Design a protein around this ligand. Structure first.
Ligand code: MG
Ligand code: MG
Ligand code: MG
Ligand code: MG
Ligand code: MG
Lengths: 64, 93, 93, 113, 348, 274
RNA sequence: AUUGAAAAAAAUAAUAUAUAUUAUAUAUAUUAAUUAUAAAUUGAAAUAUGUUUAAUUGAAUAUAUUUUAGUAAUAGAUAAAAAUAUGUACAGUAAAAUUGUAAGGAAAACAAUAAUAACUUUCUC
RNA sequence: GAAAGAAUUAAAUUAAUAUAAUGGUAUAACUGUGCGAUAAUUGUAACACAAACGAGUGAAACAAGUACGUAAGUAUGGCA
């Protein structure tokens, strides 16, 4: 399995949720879409937990 | 294997805010082989330079106007033409 | 006014006799210090330069002394001489 | 972290880079800005005039050459032919040097070859 | 020194501020700029070095050039050429540049920016071409106010409108704005700023506000509607605000009827057009023209036909666009217009 | 996206709408880079350019005099030939490519007061091939270039891929710098006076070198770069040093004219000319 | 505002404050910033407080308080090296072949290679 | 007569298009860049194309909300 399915649950606690597909070790996928219960654009976040390909956090502060 | 300097996140130059690279430059006097001085802008900090080998003493740039040297130095008392005439019998070849 | 800072750290290595002379020749910028009024704004300094102003950088072993552009011939007003005007195009009449 | 060679490369890079080496922006007052504009415009005009003068002079020279060559063609055909040759490999003489800022010790050479 | 002389030359070419003028013309960089009002900021400020002597030299150079131009300008007889010469003479004057750049062009005070002066007028034209004219052209093309009403426009005069009498607030209308029915309840005010050399005494103008987007249900299309029509208006380069003060009741060929868009009829373009009159020779004074007031109709109005009839040339334009809101019924009631129709939401 | 169909609508006016001016997004960018109010401002005409002045005074008139050919007409270049209409298949046919060449060549004009040859631009291409191993070498080369010129270099990247030479695609390898105006002139003057005399056995730029149209070139070894005064002043700061190509671009119609011009600026020419 | 130098004001735009209107307007004041961001027993600079030399300032040196040095690429709305493959806004043109050029060679990189009639502005005979 | 601009004409889609092949694409659908990361959103979708049914395809419009754009507008994933 290369591309897995996930459940994005609305942040405005309606219960509304949208499902999308991602690569197995993709970053946490949050997106702003229309919640029809609330009748506005709200944040969606992943309901379940899963492991991620850990990227090194690129440093803008010039280290050393 | 490939030796590199790994890049940091690039700094966003905004459109319109880009400024031209005006490097720090000193006015430098070059005295050539002869006494002709010329001013040139230069990044290295030296107000005056005098040059030894230039176009103004090269034969290619003015046609109208060191083993050998070592040899000359260490066979100077003898003074080494007359010498050629003495040591040039053309029978044997 | 718009020129960059002179990157002295490159041209002069830290803890060297040549650097020390350069430092002595130079004079530093006035830094910001708490509890004081700076009526020409607070000092903006990076690599030891007031960003708000122009920077001045003061610098065989012989001084390069250029020759005088006016000549002896020019002074005398000798019309037959070729060295009489050095900055102009002379024509034979 | 880094080698001495890596450090020296970084220093070299810095020399070229605009990172923390450049001053504040050149702000002007409105009167000062106007004065600057008038300085620049006048200068530009002067430069244009100079260009026209030089260009005009060149045109005049060209006209004179044309006038000469027609006359030469009319009079002596051989002389005209000699004048009008291909000067493909013509090289400026190496004595005609680019005028320096200050003159040399020996201004002029009276002897040659 | 031609630019210091004000015997024949207008007063507007000088800077009216004394301090600013003094700062401009000094022998050393001793004084501090009048623009910087605050003491601390003046102290902080440092002008670029050597600027004075060079500036003075530049002034002398351009002053000499101006003087030379003036030598030609007075000998010239034909008017457009003379004006062009005058412009050439004074355009590089620092004082006139200061005046124009840093003071308002829209509501110009005559002593600072005089549009009677040719140079200032040229500057104003150039400024208009740089932004406002382009914008106007874009709004005419995008909204489709050109081909729908009047084929083309060659923008010559800068036209700005206002609605002072309705609400109370002061605002010049940006082209292609959505105005409320309250805002456009009473009539607008025009300002036709002319930049070409034109006979101020003789040249008359007409102003027509037209609504191409009123629905005609017999044709199953739209028809035009002359919402406001003025004729024979006198403009002057400085005195150019077309207000009930200026124009008389005789000038009004069709008195202002407000935008009253119907519900679901859509967005309605109101595109004011400014024409200049045809100028007749061998006749002193302003040549008027009579309009057949029974012939031209307001509920249906061929703008192009009208233009052809009276030999007009469209020099300027401006546009707003109104759509239905709650207060249009109130506006109709105030004006005594009928209740107003209501259309289906679907364009079936 | 409902469609990909690109189709610019016609307009009903001749006014040229500058779309950049109608926005309020980039207020600093509306000013020209020549204008003082722009952050992109740089003092251009800072001092009197010496080589340029010399060209103006002495050379340009001489060059004009040299290049005068009596009643010389224009020599048209090789162009795309049209088909003779001796067949109905010629009717919307693309034109035949030029005679010898695949690309079209320019017309050679007679030299008059307007179109006298002169220096247009210098380009200093330095592609260091050891930088396939070491990226830091490219940086050092760029610095060297900057030092030499007093102008900001631009990084060269490997555009191609090849196995024989150990070369990847998209790898920083040396640098280039297009000099123009006064800096270029200075660089030429330095080349003529300081550097090219200190090369021991140098005859000249080859007469077989160059473009077909007003462009001449040559190159300097790593040995030759140590004569540049910014390099020359300190041997110690530069342990390594990289060669370079030097593309001189003239306003010359043909290459012999360009060579003659360069000779006027004290560049020696040695080989047998074409 | 105090400080330096030797009556006021008349744009745009931004910022601050106020109010006008079923109008993101107007009024007054002022022109900031603009390539930066934590962490340095070691480099460099300033200021303050002492001491010694030629009330004095320069010069030298000690402590304190700061400031700088973390040195890192794009400087251009970048435009066919590589990299964010869906939106939108603005802008531009590729390729091949040919002629050259330091190592460079058929094959690394860079340069150059169709025509200006008319139009606008600028300078000029 | 010169400089600069606006450009126009000719040529080109042989490169490039995430991917086959074909059609299309410089008015670019290709490429660069700012913002953004939203429309790779939510309910009704007529009417067509295609079509035994099951399905498939293009899609005006109405309503809710979002992003970019000075605006006009564009976006209900990708030139097809
Ligand atoms: Mg294809
Ligand atoms: Mg069918
Ligand atoms: Mg079916
Ligand atoms: Mg696409
Ligand atoms: Mg695609």
């Amino acid at each position: 399995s290369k591309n897995s399915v996930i459940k994005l649950l609305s942040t405005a606690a309606s219960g509304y949720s949208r499902y999308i597909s991602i690569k197995k070790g993709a970053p946490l996928v949050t997106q702003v879409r229309y919640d029809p219960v609330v009748k506005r654009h709200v944040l969606f976040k992943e309901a379940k937990k899963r492991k991620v390909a850990e990227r090194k956090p690129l440093d803008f502060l010039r280290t050393a | 294997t490939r030796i590199t300097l790994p890049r940091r996140p690039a700094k966003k130059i905004q459109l319109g805010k880009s400024r031209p690279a005006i490097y720090h430059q000193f006015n430098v006097k070059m005295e050539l082989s002869d006494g002709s001085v010329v001013i040139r802008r230069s990044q290295y900090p030296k107000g005056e330079i005098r040059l030894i080998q230039d176009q103004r003493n090269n034969p290619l740039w003015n046609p109208s106007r060191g083993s050998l040297d070592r040899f000359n130095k260490r066979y100077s008392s003898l003074f080494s033409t007359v010498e050629l005439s003495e040591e040039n019998k053309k029978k044997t070849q | 006014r718009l020129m960059w800072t002179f990157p002295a750290y490159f041209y002069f290595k830290k803890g060297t006799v040549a650097e020390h002379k350069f430092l002595s020749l130079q004079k530093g910028p006035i830094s910001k210090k708490n509890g004081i009024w700076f009526p020409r704004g607070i000092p903006d300094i990076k690599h030891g330069r007031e960003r708000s102003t122009k920077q001045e950088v003061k610098l065989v072993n012989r001084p390069v002394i250029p020759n005088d552009r006016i000549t002896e011939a020019d002074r005398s007003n000798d019309m037959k001489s070729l060295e009489r005007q050095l900055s102009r195009t002379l024509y034979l009449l | 972290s880094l080698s001495p060679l890596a450090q020296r490369v970084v220093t070299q890079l810095s020399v070229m880079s605009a990172s923390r080496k450049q001053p504040k922006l050149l702000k002007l007052a409105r009167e000062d800005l106007i004065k600057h504009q008038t300085i620049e415009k006048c200068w530009s005009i002067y430069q244009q005039q100079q260009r026209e003068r030089r260009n005009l002079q060149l045109e005049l020279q060209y006209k004179s050459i044309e006038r000469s060559m027609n006359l030469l063609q009319e009079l002596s055909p051989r002389l005209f032919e000699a004048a009008n040759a291909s000067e493909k490999g013509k090289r400026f003489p190496m004595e005609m040097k680019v005028p320096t800022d200050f003159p040399p010790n020996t201004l002029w050479h009276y002897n040659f070859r | 020194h031609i630019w210091s002389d004000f015997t024949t030359r207008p007063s507007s070419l000088s800077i009216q501020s004394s301090k600013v003028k003094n700062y401009l013309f000094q022998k050393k960089a001793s004084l501090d700029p009048p623009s910087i009002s605050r003491r601390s900021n003046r102290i902080k400020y440092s002008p670029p070095e050597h600027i004075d002597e060079i500036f003075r030299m530049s002034y002398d150079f351009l002053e000499q050039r101006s003087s030379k131009f003036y030598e030609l300008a007075n000998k010239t007889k034909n008017p457009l050429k003379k004006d062009a010469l005058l412009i050439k003479a004074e355009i590089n004057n620092p004082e006139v540049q200061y005046n124009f750049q840093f003071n308002n062009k829209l509501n110009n005070v005559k002593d600072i920016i005089d549009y009677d002066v040719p140079v200032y007028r040229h500057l104003g034209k150039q400024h208009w071409e740089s932004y406002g004219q382009m914008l106007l052209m874009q709004r005419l093309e995008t909204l489709a106010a050109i081909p729908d009403t009047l084929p083309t426009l060659v923008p010559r005069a800068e036209v700005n409108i206002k609605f002072p009498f309705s609400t109370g607030v002061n605002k010049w209308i940006e082209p292609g704005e959505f105005l409320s029915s309250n805002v456009t309840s009473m009539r607008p005010i025009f300002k036709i700023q002319e930049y070409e050399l034109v006979n101020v005494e003789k040249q008359l103008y007409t102003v027509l506000i037209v609504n191409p987007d009123v629905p005609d249900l017999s044709n199953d299309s739209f028809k035009t509607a002359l919402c406001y029509g003025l004729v024979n208006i006198n403009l002057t380069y400085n005195d150019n605000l077309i207000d009930p003060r200026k124009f008389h009741s005789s000038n009004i060929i069709a008195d202002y009827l407000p935008p009253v868009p119907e519900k679901n009829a859509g967005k309605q373009r109101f595109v004011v057009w400014v024409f200049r009159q045809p100028l007749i020779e061998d006749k002193q004074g302003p040549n008027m023209l009579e309009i057949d007031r029974k012939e031209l109709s307001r509920d249906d109005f061929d703008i192009r036909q009208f233009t052809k009839k009276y030999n007009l040339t469209a020099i300027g334009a401006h546009i707003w666009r109104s759509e239905w809101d709650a207060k249009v019924a109130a506006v109709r009631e105030k004006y005594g217009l009928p209740p107003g129709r209501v259309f289906s939401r679907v364009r079936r | 996206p409902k469609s990909a169909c690109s189709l610019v609508k016609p307009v009903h006016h001749l006014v040229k709408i500058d779309k950049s001016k109608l926005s309020p997004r980039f207020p600093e960018l509306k000013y020209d880079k020549s204008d003082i109010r722009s952050p992109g401002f740089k003092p251009k005409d800072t001092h009197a350019d010496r080589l340029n002045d010399h060209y103006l005074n002495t050379l340009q008139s001489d060059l004009l005099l040299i290049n005068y050919s009596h009643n010389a007409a224009v020599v048209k270049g090789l162009k795309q030939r049209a088909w003779s209409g001796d067949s109905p298949y010629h009717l919307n046919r693309p034109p035949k490519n030029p005679r010898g060449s695949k690309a079209q060549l320019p017309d050679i004009h007679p030299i008059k007061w307007s179109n006298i040859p002169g220096l247009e631009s210098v380009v200093i291409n330095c592609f260091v091939r050891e930088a396939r191993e070491n990226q830091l070498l490219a940086i050092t080369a760029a610095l060297q270039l900057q030092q030499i010129t007093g102008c900001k270099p631009h990084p060269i990247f490997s555009k191609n891929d090849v196995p024989t030479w150990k070369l990847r695609k998209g790898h920083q390898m040396g640098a280039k710098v297009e000099l123009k105006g006064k800096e270029m002139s200075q660089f030429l003057s330095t080349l003529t006076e300081i550097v090219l005399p200190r090369i021991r056995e140098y005859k000249g730029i080859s007469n077989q070198s160059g473009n077909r149209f007003g462009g001449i070139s040559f190159g300097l070894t790593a040995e030759d770069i140590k004569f540049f005064p910014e390099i020359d002043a300190n041997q110690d700061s530069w342990p390594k040093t990289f060669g370079m190509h030097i593309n001189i671009n003239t306003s010359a119609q043909l290459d012999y004219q360009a060579r003659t011009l360069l000779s006027g600026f004290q560049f020696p020419f040695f080989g047998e000319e074409k």
